[PDB]
Design a protein around this ligand. Structure first.
Ligand code: SF4
Ligand code: SF4
Ligand code: FCO
Ligand SMILES: [Cl-]
Ligand SMILES: [Fe+2]
Ligand SMILES: [Kr]
Ligand SMILES: [Kr]
Ligand SMILES: [Kr]
Ligand SMILES: [Kr]
Ligand SMILES: [Kr]
Ligand SMILES: [Kr]
Ligand SMILES: [Kr]
Ligand SMILES: [Kr]
Ligand SMILES: [Kr]
Ligand SMILES: [Kr]
Ligand SMILES: [Kr]
Ligand code: NI
Ligand SMILES: [S]
Lengths: 277, 481
């Protein structure tokens, strides 16, 4: 099982929580049979300078062989002060500091959530933290480590679990940088895996007929019509939520109310207002 | 003598927390809590269609987004002058309630329990402190583990209960201004009730028992963490359409003395937080948020709230204390059987034990039962097919305020509209009441206080510093936003 570090920055802990809802494999199977989770501030036993030290050890042990998960965006302003993650050897660690230390020496970097991938909400209109997406941060610091974006706010568990597998299986088949090249190949222009984000919501919506008829809902609770007038953003969103649906399949966003296109790079500003056409 | 320990990051919480304790004579004597990550939703939200708030503000926290959606729409409701259909009111309580269950199961099993249970021999459950203080038998500990593994599917199910009427979780789509966006069908009220019964059973049979079971091995823990012994509740889960009867009714308790709750006695101090000096002391309706990350002496992104100068605490204990409801069945038994104690209401636990490291864990296990009763009572009240939402008009200029109780304690959103766009939004959230630094008078935050006197026999293994903190169920994302 390859070693995984899970580093939160300007996240809402949403990425982690949606992953705990992965049904098959349940999160327990993921943790015990798929990956070795070596650092995750929210679930792990040890703490503090001890918890960091164990990571630098494993990081130095498996140089080029650990997988680095980033939840939340990277706030560069104020010298990184807007997001401190730890303290070790009496020096405090920004997310900037951490992404520098570990980014270079990773097999790959998984930016999870729309915050990490594209910057999202802490980077939105009204923010003064310089919140930066992972992929942009790394290039702007010379690091060439491969980055895979698994966006969402939050992402569906399957989009994550899904992405881990299809990369380990790309690595089993072809070795490491061989699998990583295969992994980079199945990405659209926004660093997203096309297995999950390769189809549009609208083009596959079941209310598309109501769209073409021009029958729209006037109240949300009216499940008969198309939701465009209420503010659905299916027309410009790329995701397979129409198929797999959410929380074991018990509902999803268009059926329940509207789609806000949470998987897209411009979310939230480009997709707001959420509730007008 | 005086040795300084620093724990950064405090794990098995939500978010970025540094805790600093100074130790002399094998006990904590001073503490300092730092919130190390800031986003500033309070400025980000400015300028937007007010109806955007009901989505943006959930991204504050991924664990308790429905507490935020709920606080938010309540404020918008007031600001828009919307009347929430009776059957919408219930649907909202059913979306929110199901995550209380999810949050509280999550906290104990997957965040705290490892304070008392050795998981398996696979990362991330090792490497851990050598002298951890894990006192459970090989049997009780393997039972502790079997259930953790089980909570993984119970809490996952609670998020399917949420998602039936909310749309998804985390981050519901279903709560909007005017009510809830999907009417419960008979079909899905079963879907919910089926899952609810599986959860009803686990909480009654496994979770509440094992908190007492484990508690009685750690009876010394009811003797520490008392802090200011003051509590706050602001009301949650409305039971009528008038705004009078609520599942939790408001109230304050400070100095053996019960009092009523007056939101205007709320002020947020920032002497020791990285926010511009010129904003300290205001009330939520006049609030401003000006980050000052280089301010000398400040040591947290969490503001310092006080209620009429008091440093209070919030959450299950704080709620269960103010309301003093009748104790659950499973709890009255094992208090007799394992603690040898007789109590019928909550306050029969007394001020010291209730307000203890292990007394809050228990409030949280008792409050969950209380919610099994609230939800079973709402699944009777809900009526399939009846309308849940109204579609109001955006006020050009309006103001509203939403009060509720997040799983971790008192939460409120205040909103000011101008030219039909957000001109001001302010959030006073649960973990802001517990995890705040000192106010301007040097008065410590409720938890900073609770830490005083905590046994650190083993400076190398200060496992109790982190056991106290975890008992409060902290969310430093909710604190800072
Ligand atoms: S606007 Fe929304 S509801 Fe209508 S067809 Fe497109 S995705 Fe479906
Ligand atoms: S349907 Fe749209 S709003 Fe809902 S989870 Fe998918 S991308 Fe996000
Ligand atoms: N529960 C929760 Fe989040 C916190 N603290 C809020 O409010
Ligand atoms: Cl919640
Ligand atoms: Fe605030
Ligand atoms: Kr996780
Ligand atoms: Kr989590
Ligand atoms: Kr596990
Ligand atoms: Kr977990
Ligand atoms: Kr990867
Ligand atoms: Kr994963
Ligand atoms: Kr991976
Ligand atoms: Kr977990
Ligand atoms: Kr455990
Ligand atoms: Kr447990
Ligand atoms: Kr019982
Ligand atoms: Ni929270
Ligand atoms: S939370």
């Amino acid at each position: 099982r390859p070693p995984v570090f899970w580093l939160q920055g300007q996240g809402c802990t949403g990425c982690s929580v949606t992953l705990l809802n992965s049904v098959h494999p349940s999160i327990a199977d993921v943790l015990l049979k798929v990956i070795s989770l070596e650092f995750h501030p929210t679930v792990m036993a040890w703490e503090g300078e001890h918890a960091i030290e164990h990571m630098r050890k494993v990081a130095e042990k498996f140089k080029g062989k650990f997988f680095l998960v980033i939840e939340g965006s990277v706030p560069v302003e104020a010298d990184g002060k807007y997001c401190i993650i730890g303290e070790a050897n009496h020096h405090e660690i920004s997310m900037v500091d951490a992404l520098k230390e570990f980014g270079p020496n990773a097999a790959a970097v998984l930016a999870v959530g729309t915050c990490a991938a594209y910057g999202g909400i802490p980077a939105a209109e009204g923010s003064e933290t310089g919140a930066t997406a992972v992929s942009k941060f790394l290039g702007d610091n010379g690091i060439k480590t491969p980055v895979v974006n698994i966006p969402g706010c939050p992402p569906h568990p399957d989009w994550i679990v899904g992405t881990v597998v299809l990369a380990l299986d790309a690595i089993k088949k072809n070795g490491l940088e061989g699998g990583l090249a295969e992994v980079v190949k199945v990405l659209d222009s926004d660093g997203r895996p096309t297995p999950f984000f390769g189809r549009n919501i609208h083009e596959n919506c079941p209310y598309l007929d109501k769209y073409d008829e021009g029958v729209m809902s006037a109240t949300f609770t009216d499940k008969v019509g198309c939701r465009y007038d209420l503010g659905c953003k299916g027309p410009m969103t790329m995701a397979d939520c129409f198929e797999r649906k959410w929380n074991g399949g018990v509902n999803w966003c268009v059926q329940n109310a509207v789609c806000i296109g949470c998987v897209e790079p411009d979310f939230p500003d480009g997709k707001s207002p959420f509730y007008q056409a | 003598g005086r040795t300084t320990i620093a724990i950064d990051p405090v794990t098995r919480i939500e978010g970025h927390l540094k805790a600093e304790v100074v130790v002399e004579n094998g006990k904590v004597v001073d503490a300092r809590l730092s919130g190390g990550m800031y986003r500033g939703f309070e400025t980000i939200l400015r300028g937007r269609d007010p109806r955007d708030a009901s989505q943006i503000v959930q991204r504050i926290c991924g664990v308790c987004p429905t507490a935020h959606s709920t606080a938010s729409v309540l404020a918008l409701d007031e600001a828009f002058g919307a009347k929430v259909p009776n059957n919408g009111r219930i649907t909202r309580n059913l979306i929110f309630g199901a995550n209380y269950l999810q949050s509280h199961i999550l906290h104990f099993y997957h965040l705290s329990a490892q304070d008392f249970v050795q998981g398996p021999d696979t990362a991330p459950f090792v490497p851990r402190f050598p002298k951890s203080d894990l006192r459970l038998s090989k049997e009780l500990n393997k039972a502790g583990v079997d259930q953790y593994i089980e909570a993984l599917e119970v809490r996952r199910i609670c998020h399917e209960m949420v998602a039936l009427f909310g749309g998804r979780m985390p981050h519901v789509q279903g709560q909007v201004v005017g009510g809830a966006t999907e009417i419960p069908t008979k079909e899905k009220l079963v879907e919910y009730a089926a899952r609810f019964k599986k959860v009803r059973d686990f909480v009654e049979q496994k979770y509440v028992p094992v908190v007492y079971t484990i508690g009685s091995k750690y009876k010394d823990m009811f003797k520490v963490g008392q802090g200011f012994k003051a509590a706050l509740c602001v009301g949650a889960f409305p039971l009528d359409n008038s705004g009078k009867k609520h599942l939790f009714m408001p109230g304050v308790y400070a100095k053996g003395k019960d009092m009523p709750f007056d939101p205007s006695k709320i002020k947020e101090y920032v002497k020791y937080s990285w926010f511009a000096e010129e904003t300290t002391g205001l009330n939520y309706k006049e609030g401003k948020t000006i980050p000052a990350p280089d301010k000398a002496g400040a040591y947290s992104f969490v503001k310092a709230p006080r209620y009429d100068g008091l440093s209070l605490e919030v959450g299950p204990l704080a709620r269960m204390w103010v309301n003093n409801p009748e104790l659950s069945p499973v709890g009255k038994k094992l208090l007799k059987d394992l603690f040898g104690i007789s109590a019928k209401k909550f306050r029969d636990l007394g001020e010291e034990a209730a307000f203890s490291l292990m007394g809050r864990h228990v409030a949280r296990a008792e409050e969950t039962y209380y919610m099994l009763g609230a939800i079973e009572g709402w699944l009777k009240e809900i009526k399939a097919g009846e309308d849940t939402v109204v579609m109001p008009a955006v006020p050009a200029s309006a103001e509203g305020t939403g009060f509720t109780e997040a799983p971790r304690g008192s939460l409120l959103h205040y909103v000011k509209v101008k030219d039909s766009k957000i001109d001001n939004y302010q959030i006073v959230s649960a973990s802001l009441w517990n995890c705040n630094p000192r106010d301007d008078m040097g008065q410590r935050g409720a938890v900073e206080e609770a830490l005083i006197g905590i046994p650190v026999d083993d400076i190398q293994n200060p496992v109790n510093v982190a056991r106290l903190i975890r008992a409060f169920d902290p969310x430093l994302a909710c604190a800072v936003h």
